[PDB]
């Protein structure tokens, strides 16, 4: 007692750093690692390394290097510079190519300035880039590029890149280019936003700008005209300087052309077979096409008999979208995470020209991901171990006997490590395990043959020593029983926690569909500061709508957002208050985006449980949020469908009940995702009913509020608000 | 132990000031609206007749927003479907009711979404503007004649002003001027083709899925300004077959050299218009005098008749060149001009003679010329007891300029030191309007012997109510800064005690030619703060303030955010040195220019002010409109005054806000001081790591004047000031 604590300045200035081990596999036995601006090549088997690229090589380059991409064949390296961020994944940059053999920059036929995407072929040294929404291909870095599409037009026709909604909610990527495994075929999507309405907002820029700029983004809100999609494939081997490149269109199924549809997944099975998944605008019916190259005709035929249909009666298909297929090397079969009869997600074995699939996994738990596939074994992550949904462990199923299941991670360090992710080598000969809690992160390399522990890569020993000197908070992960169902919660407990003493409680909420805020992960965040320094219990709760516990829980919120997930956060806090170590006169709630929505809906409930709370960039009314995400859970806002609950599930309609609570409303003006609009309507509804509240806008900040200064400012302002709400010095 | 003047009393408007709004329709009669009845009153004897009974428009179907009766009392305009645009501009539907026939005009009705309507000054001719084009109706029932065809939304404005002309030049949407007999209709044409657009989000009702973007032609400081043309049309010679001929009056040669404004339009006679023009650099103004040639049908503006008004110390006029007051023949006029000593006084101009003769002199200013007869010119000034914040009606004998008589001074010198006036058509009777320091008092008088005829409204009903309330007193006095008198007021709490120490809120505006220390009686937020919370609300008139000579007003020329900021600090500093104020609890607040000066004071690092509130503040002068900014600052070029434009920003003083508690408030739909200005303040404070309170108001303009928003802002500002001064 009476020693150092984890301060707000420690969180903001990043005094206590987590070390990472970010490696990129270049073959079955070698990986690359960036260390003090030197790129090293490492041998997985023996552990030896050499300087692949010297940090001194690009000293007289004349530009600040943002990122590196080396060609699969290790002959060339892309230098990314002049990085200008757009949305979450999208950005623009200039690119130069450096010949490693010749040790010199390619000066002729250069990649243009303001390039939108670049990618190597997965083998060799071929480049496909996007510039002014049009796709270009280079066979050699030094030779001229071949233009593939001519239809590209800013904010209208997107060739090889996503529009706003496809980027954020479908592909989680700017890229809509897919090379074939050998690099013969370049598959691309085309998005058409002609009839899609624009979100318009002011961007104020530097002081020097006299007239504010208006930003105009094609953004389909709930029920609005969506973008249309086409899918094309091009033969890269037969490109001539004389003739234009011939792009063969793959049409979507007849069952999708009936109405509005999305292209939600693209996976190459072999060199001559593409898997395309399509999803109806009502996201309860999805169709997987298997499309084969006709070697004579030069076409792509997608037999109707080969189609695999995935549908839901209880809600929507998949966690966020239809799950990724993992093909056997021959491409005549694949593995896919599917919801079983009991509503739990498990691996299903599909054979191409045979009906149904065979479930290879079962039980009251879920497979999170399929990570690798050999002839002998399929490697997957799940939350099976100790029946803890918030835990993650790497498992291995013998394909010759599905009963032979081996945990590879569970017992490596069972007190320190209960949350693993994995990175396999090109043919899964070695894997990197990445532990992220409940102890400090631990990065370890393994051999697939015997599942032997080779090496430790990073153990965070330097950090461990420093945090021994600091009064750090403990993390309790447990459950409470509501209507005979286990629901999991966590509490960031202050140092030297005392069950006799009564503590003020902040409820940290997200609570979106398929979310998890009660897990075994180690975080140095704002909650650490609040517990360490200010002696606040920061609790999170996974109620109805939360993921990784079966559809019974996750689909409970179907067509009914801002109901059970709101009710359950109130009931969680109420049950925490009835525990002996919580001061029921000092219970707060805060969250971001969906967290902001649920925070606002709880404060507007009239429960009496919550004294104060903070909504950062909240959703206020579901008609204001994008089509793909909102319609997944709510359907369309028509009288025929679910308009009644769209209108019944707003923050604005609960304005009267904010008289009983102290509310802080925060939002960035340049939020391209949850538009400032949503907070603008909350504030106006509170003004209209005569409710006092604190507010704070952030000029030109997006959904992150992630600029160094803005990040420091919001957490400082939010700290002051929570401190004064709980009567703390 | 009586009740106090609460915040609820201010916001729900418990204690109402009664008015007496009259419109003179002749030399001896005025119109007065009472319980939705319009009455005609006889000025001499005081008897009345019901002109329009309130029951007449019960089955009309729409809510009537305003009434306008024709000069000849034969028709009445019914204004309904009122949709407000900017401060003066709005759109409405109009019906005309025939008083003779006792029936609504059913045929050839005024269009829906009409932008302006006005009667001829005599008879029953109507001129209206619709889709930015002027129309004329000779009879209400007959079809209208189209005058202009060039009108186009946001581009060509015929007969109506654009944004900047409305707000900063004419203080009116109307750019339409009839001749004294209804013969000629003069109009201005504004061209906003190359004027850049301010763009801001309007979120509207909850139901609207996609926010609207509002696009307004708005010239910021240094930007491309609107161009102006001036036309005159003969309404007597309008044909149903042939198009109407508009004769252009060209601006003087000294204005066409560069960028200019049309700043005043005044008919002298039936055959004469006076136009005033102002250069974009507002140190040079030209009055033109234009006569109708009956033979050619042209308007000729002889070069020798031109009158030039210029300033070396600053800008022309208080805000613009002053209006001329013509003698009945129109061969002479009177005009308030700055004299050799820098004080504003009446100057006698004869049309074909150079220069003018000064009729008034002294260390005080003429505010306005109110009426003109063959015998007397009636004017308001601040002469009485050498009080700049006092206003009184005077009368000067035109046959002997030494014979000056105060008509208002001695009517009730304890109750009334602030008068405005409304004369009848030929100045036979006048309504005096007292505004303070006591309750407002409305009295009618006869010009002949200056006899007090009648009391119209004395606010006796209010007097009774305020006896039950612990009301705050007002002290108006001065302090000595560099051997100069500068005036201040203080709203002192009830049962004020000079032995006890009180917290002080400094209420600031301090814009060029402003006055916040006066003798006017106000029931406002300051009344609540003094009555209930026992706070001294002080205001101070420093360098830049008006009605005290150019030496003071022009001290801030090309130097905004300097001396007016310094002097508010020094005023507060001197108030702290008084024994009855707590120097550890001094706050500052203001709106627009007040918000700018509040921000600049808090960013000074003086240590005088603990906290303050900037509502809809200007942050950088490059963000505010051309006409206002360039009047005081010149152009933002390296050639001119860009150095001080860049040195006079709130953003550059961000570091010093670490030492103070700052509340920054702004409406998102502010068309005047754009939300931009607060958006750049906030970003600069975040960028240098300064904590501050903030509050935006969705879809509120510069007023923040909607019932709910008004209640909310003053509640939020109350909570902030209370917690800053540690008040129960
Ligand atoms: C991205 O997505 C948008 C739509 O969301 C799409 O733009 C649309 O393109 C179609 C097809 O080109 C347009 O419909 C055509 O319009 C023309 C006339 O164009 C003018 O008028 C329309 C409104 O009426 C405007 O929108 C447009 O801007 C122009 O001002 C019609 O003449 C076309 O009719 C033909 O097709 C019919 C059906 O086959 C025939 O029956 C008819 O006789 C016409 O025949 C012509 O085409 C035949 C093709 O087989 C040919 O055989 C004939 O000989 C003859 O040439 C047609 O209705 C639609 O208006 C556009 N909408 C919008 C909002 O822009 C983009 O093209 C798409 N972009 C990409 C790259 O995929
Ligand atoms: C409102 O103001 C704008 C200018 O701000 C006027 O538009 C301008 O009109 C002139 C007319 O002389 C155009 O110049 C001419 O252009 C043609 C070619 O189009 C050329 O052949 C002629 O010799 C002459 O130079 C000018 O281009 C045009 N500018 C713009 C920006 O449109 C407009 O006429 C004004 N409208 C009214 C009703 O007063
Ligand atoms: C570059 O590499 C050298 C040798 O490994 C090392 O000493 C130096 O710190 C590096 N330079 C940096 C980090 O700028
Ligand atoms: C590792 O050692 C072997 C044998 O000396 C060598 O050939 C190989 O290049 C080394 N690998 C790396 C990555 O340096
Ligand atoms: C990118 O911009 C710079 C600066 O204008 C220019 O020197 C360079 O040539 C441009 N890049 C290409 C590929 O043309
Ligand atoms: C390729 O197609 C485009 C039309 O989209 C055309 O401009 C171009 O001439 C074509 N190229 C050749 C070589 O024919
Ligand atoms: C709407 O919300 C109210 C209040 O939460 C609830 O009583 C009602 O059941 C909801 N459902 C419908 C269909 O209106
Ligand atoms: C109409 O006028 C009479 C006085 O003539 C007044 O007493 C009455 O209240 C008025 N009614 C309305 C509805 O304004
Ligand atoms: C006032 O009284 C006189 C005499 O009866 C009358 O002629 C006049 O019309 C009255 N005026 C009004 C406005 O009622
Ligand atoms: C104005 O609109 C109303 C309907 O709102 C219509 O009855 C009327 O005819 C319109 N007036 C004119 C003069 O066009
Ligand atoms: C009046 O001028 C307009 C064009 O400005 C035209 O439409 C109309 O025909 C003209 N009428 C006559 C009689 O010249
Ligand atoms: C009004 O004055 C003008 C001056 O030109 C004249 O033409 C017209 O006849 C006069 N009208 C009346 C009604 O006296
Ligand atoms: C700028 O403003 C500062 C205010 O502290 C003043 O000291 C200085 O004299 C001014 N000079 C210029 C060029 O702004």
The four Cα atoms A86, A88, A92, A95 give a dihedral, to 10 degrees, of 160
Residues A430/A446, Cβ–Cβ less than 8 Å: yes
Distance from CA of A673 to the nearest CA of B (A): 13
Structure tokens at B203: 């979120």
Q: B641 to each of B564, B634, B648, how far by Cα in Å? A: 18, 6, 11
Residue B657, phi-psi category: left (phi > 0), alpha (psi -120 to 50), beta (remainder): alpha
Ligand 10 geometric centre to CA of B112 (Å)? 6
Peptide bond preceding B302 in cis form (omega within 30 of 0):
no
Distances (CA, A) of A35 to A18, A64, B291: 15, 17, 87
Q: What value, to the nearest 5°, has the Cα angle with vertex A490 and ends A487 and A493?
A: 150
- Say which ligand is closest to the CA of B96: 10
Tokens 């001080």 sit on residue = B644
Query: Between β-strands B611-615 and B661-667, what pairing exists: parallel, antiparallel or unpaired?
Result: parallel
- Residue in A693, A713, A714 to test binding to B, most B beta-carbons within 10 Å: A713
Q: Which residues of A touch B203 (CB under 8 A)?
A: 677, 680-681, 684
CA–CA gap between residue A638 and residue B312 (Å, rounded): 68
Q: How close, in Å, is residue B660 to chain A by CA atoms?
A: 15
Method for this entry: X-ray
Cross-chain Cβ contact B696/A690 below 8 Å = no
Q: A152, A112, A117: which is closest to A133 by C-alpha?
A: A152
Q: Kindly list the distances between the CA atom of residue B46 and the CA atoms of B72, B200, B448, B453, in Å, as whole numbers in the listed order.
A: 21, 53, 17, 9
The neighbouring-strand residues paired with A49 are A42
Q: Answer whether A330's CB lies under 8 Å from A352's CB.
A: no
CA distance A533 to A530: 6
d(CA A103, CA A81): 19
Six-digit token string for B31: 């119109």
User: Which residues of A are known catalytic residues?
Assistant: 593, 671, 703
CB contact under 8 Å between A717 and B691, yes or no, is yes
Nearest to B660 by CA among B583, B559, B588: B588
Q: What angle do CA B5, B7, B11 make, to 5 degrees?
A: 110
In sequence order, which residues have a C-beta less than 8 Å from that of residue A195 and are 6 or more positions away? A225
- Tokens 């540690």 found at: B726
Separation of alpha carbons A204 and B200, rounded Å = 10
Query: Are the beta carbons of B674 and A212 separated by less than 8 Å?
Result: yes
Q: Which of A256, A255, A247, A279 is nearest to A266 (CA)?
A: A279
Distance CA B476, CA B174 (A): 38
Nearest residue in B to A695, CA atom: B695
Residues B274 and B252 sit within 8 Å (Cβ to Cβ): no
Cβ atoms of residues A134 and A150 within 8 Å: yes
Whole-angstrom Cα distance, residue A166 to residue A162? 5
B234 in helix, strand or coil?
A: strand
Q: How would CATH label the architecture of B468-724?
A: 3-Layer(aba) Sandwich (3.40)
Do the strands B502-507 and B536-540 form a parallel or antiparallel pair, or are they unpaired? parallel
* CA A563 to ligand 7: nearest atom: 5
- Extents of the domains making up chain A: 19-192, 470-725
CA–CA distance, A31 with A25 (Å, rounded to integer) = 4
| B691 neighbourhood in chain A, CB within 8 Å | 713, 716-717, 720
Span from the CA of A150 to the centroid of ligand 6 (angstroms)? 8
Angle at A480 between CA A479 and CA A485, to 5 degrees: 100
Distance of alpha carbon B90 from alpha carbon B80, whole angstroms: 11
H-only helix segments in B476-584: 525-531, 550-553, 563-577
Name the H helices within A166-276. 254-257
Q: Are B681 and B602 in contact (CB under 8 A)?
A: no
Distance from CA of B592 to the nearest CA of A (A): 18
Chain A partners within 8 Å of B679 (Cβ): 202, 204, 669, 697, 699
Which ligand 6 atom minimizes the distance to the CA of A147?
A: 1
DSSP output for B649-694: -SGGGGGGGGGSEEEEEEETT-SSS-THHHHHHHHHHHHTT---EE
Contact B712/A690, CB-based, under 8 Å? yes
The 3-state secondary structure of A630-691, one letter per residue = HHHHHCCCCCCCCHHHHHHCCCHHHHHHHHHCEEEEEEECCCCCCCHHHHHHHHHHHHHHCC
Q: Which ligand is nearest to the CA of B81?
A: 10
DSSP codes joined into one string, B429-481: EEEEEE-SBSS-EEEEEETTTTEEEEEEE--HHHHHHHTTEEPPEEEEEEEEE
Exposed, middle or buried, A240 (CB in 10 Å: 0-12/13-18/19+)? exposed
Q: Which residues have CB under 8 Å from A351's CB, separation 6+?
A: A332, A333
Chain A positions touching B719 (Cβ under 8 A) are 692
Report the alpha-carbon angle B223-B229-B233, nearest 5: 155
C-beta separation of B597 from B568 below 8 A: yes
Rounded Cα distance, A681 and A676, in Å: 9
User: Which site among B203, B651, B670, B708 would you substitute to test the A interface, given the most A Cβ atoms closer than 10 Å to its Cβ?
Assistant: B203
The protein residue whose alpha carbon is closest to atom 5 in ligand 4 is A48
* Dist. CA B590 → ligand 13 center (Å): 23
Neighbours of B506 (CB within 10 A): 27
| Alpha-carbon gap, residue B34 to B38, rounded angstroms | 6
Q: How many CB pairs below 8 A link A and B? A: 120
Torsion B515-B519-B522-B524 (CA) sign: positive
Written out in words, the top-level CATH class of the domain with range A470-725 is alpha beta
Phi, psi of A65 (to 5 degrees): -75, 125
Residues of chain B neighbouring A715 (CB-CB closer than 8 A): none
CB contact at 8 A, B343 and B359? no
Say if residue B331 is preceded by a cis peptide, omega within 30 of 0: no
Neighbours of B726 (CB within 10 A): 9
Using alpha carbons, select from A601, A566, A608 the residue that is nearest to residue A587.
A608
Q: Which residue has the tokens 């498990």?
A: A346
Separation CA A278–CA A225 (nearest Å): 18
Residue bearing the CA closest to ligand 11, atom 14: B243
Output the six-digit token pair for B38. Answer: 């319009």
* Alpha-helical segments (H) within A192-253: none
For A659, the token pair is: 């008289």
Is residue B625 within 8 A of residue B543, CB to CB? The reply is no
Residue B392 bridge partners (DSSP): B381
Burial of B518 (0-12, 13-18, 19+ CB in 10 A): buried
Q: In terms of CA atoms, which chain B residue is nearest residue A650? A: B206
β-sheet bridge partners, residue B231: B187, B248
Which atom number of ligand 4 is nearest to the Cα of residue A50?
Answer: 14
Ligand 2 centroid – CA B586 distance (Å): 57
CB contact at 8 A, B202 and B216: no
Nearest-Cα distance to chain A for B700, in Å, is 10
Distance CA B104, CA B509 (A): 48
Spatial neighbors of B278 by CB under 8 A, at least 6 apart, are: B260, B261, B263, B284, B285, B316, B320, B321
| Rounded Cα gap, residues B437 and B472, in angstroms | 12
Contacts for A547 with CB less than 8 Å, ≥ 6 apart: A319, A513, A514, A515, A516, A554
Contact B213 A212 (CB under 8 A): no
Q: Do B206 and A694 touch (CB under 8 A)?
A: no
* Ligand nearest to the Cα of B52, by number: 8
- Measured in whole angstroms, the distance separating CA B81 from the mean position of its chain's CA atoms is 25
The atom number, within ligand 6, closest to the CA of A243 reads 13
Query: Which of B222, B694, B699 is the closest to A696 by Cβ?
Result: B694
CATH class of A19-192: mainly beta
């Amino acid at each position: 007692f009476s020693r150092k604590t984890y301060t707000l300045t420690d969180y903001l200035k990043n005094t206590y750093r987590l070390k990472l081990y970010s490696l990129r596999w270049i073959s079955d036995h070698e990986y690359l690692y960036k260390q003090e601006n030197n790129i090293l090549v490492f041998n997985a088997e023996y552990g030896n390394s050499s300087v692949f690229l010297e940090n001194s090589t690009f000293d007289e380059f004349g530009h600040s290097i943002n990122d590196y991409s080396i060609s699969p064949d290790g002959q060339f390296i892309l230098l990314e510079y002049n990085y200008v961020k757009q949305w979450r994944h999208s950005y623009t940059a200039s690119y130069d190519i450096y010949d490693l053999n010749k040790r010199q920059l390619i000066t002729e036929e250069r990649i243009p300035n303001n390039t939108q995407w670049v990618t190597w072929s997965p083998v060799g040294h071929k480049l496909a880039y996007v510039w002014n929404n049009d796709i270009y291909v280079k066979i050699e870095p030094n030779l001229p590029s071949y233009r593939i599409t001519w239809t590209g037009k800013e904010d209208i026709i997107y060739n090889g890149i996503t529009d706003w909604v496809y980027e954020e909610e479908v592909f989680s990527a700017y890229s809509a280019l897919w090379w074939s495994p050998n690099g013969t075929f370049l598959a691309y999507a085309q998005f058409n936003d002609t009839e899609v309405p624009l979100i318009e907002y002011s961007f104020y820029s530097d002081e020097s700008l006299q007239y504010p700029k208006t930003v105009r983004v094609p953004y389909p809100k709930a029920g609005a005209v969506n973008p249309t999609v086409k899918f094309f494939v091009v033969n890269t081997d037969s490109l001539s300087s004389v003739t234009n490149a011939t792009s063969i269109q793959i049409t979507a199924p007849a069952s999708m052309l009936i109405g509005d549809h999305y292209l939600c997944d693209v996976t190459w099975a072999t060199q001559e077979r593409i898997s395309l998944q399509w999803l109806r605008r009502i996201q309860n019916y999805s169709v997987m096409d298997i499309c084969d190259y006709d070697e004579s005709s030069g076409r792509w035929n997608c037999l109707v008999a080969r189609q695999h249909i995935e549908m839901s009666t209880t809600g929507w298909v998949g966690r966020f979208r239809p799950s990724e297929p993992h093909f056997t090397l021959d491409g005549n079969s694949f593995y896919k995470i599917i919801s079983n009869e009991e509503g739990y997600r498990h691996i299903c074995y599909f054979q191409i020209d045979k009906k149904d699939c065979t479930f290879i996994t079962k039980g009251t738990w879920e497979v999170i991901g399929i990570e690798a596939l050999t002839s002998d074994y399929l490697y997957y992550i799940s939350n099976e171990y100790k029946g803890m949904p918030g835990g993650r462990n790497l498992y291995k199923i013998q394909l010759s006997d599905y009963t032979k299941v081996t945990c590879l991670s569970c017992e490596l360090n069972p007190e320190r490590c209960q949350y693993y992710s994995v990175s396999f080598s090109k043919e899964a000969k070695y894997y990197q395990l990445r532990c992220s809690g409940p102890g400090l992160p631990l990065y370890t390399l393994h051999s697939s043959v015997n599942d032997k522990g080779l090496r430790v890569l990073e153990d965070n020993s330097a950090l461990d020593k420093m945090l021994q000197n600091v009064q750090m908070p403990s993390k309790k992960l447990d459950f409470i029983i509501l209507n005979e169902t286990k629901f999991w919660y966590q509490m960031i407990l202050p140092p030297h926690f005392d069950k006799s003493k009564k503590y003020p409680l902040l409820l940290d909420v997200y609570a979106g569909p398929c979310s998890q805020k009660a897990d075994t992960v180690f975080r140095l965040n704002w909650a650490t500061y609040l517990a360490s320094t200010e002696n606040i219990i920061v609790a999170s709760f996974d109620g109805r709508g939360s993921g990784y516990q079966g559809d019974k829980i996750m689909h409970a919120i179907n067509r009914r957002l801002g109901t059970f997930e709101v009710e359950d956060q109130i009931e969680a806090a109420r049950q925490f208050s009835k525990m002996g170590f919580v001061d029921n006169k000092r219970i707060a709630i805060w969250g971001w985006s969906y967290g902001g929505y649920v925070t606002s809906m709880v404060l507007g409930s009239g429960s009496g449980v919550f004294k104060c709370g903070i909504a950062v960039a909240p959703v206020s009314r579901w008609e204001y949020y994008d089509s793909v995400y909102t319609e997944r859970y709510m359907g369309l806002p028509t009288p025929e469908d679910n308009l009644d609950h769209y209108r019944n599930s707003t923050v604005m309609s609960r304005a009267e009940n904010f008289k009983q609570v102290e509310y802080l409303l925060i939002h960035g003006t340049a939020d391209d995702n949850v538009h400032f609009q949503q907070s603008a309507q909350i504030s106006k509804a509170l003004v209209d009913v005569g409710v006092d509240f604190q507010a704070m806008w952030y000029t030109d900040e997006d959904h992150g509020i992630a600029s160094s200064t803005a990040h420091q400012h919001i957490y400082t302002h939010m700290s002051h608000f929570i401190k004064q709400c709980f009567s703390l010095p």
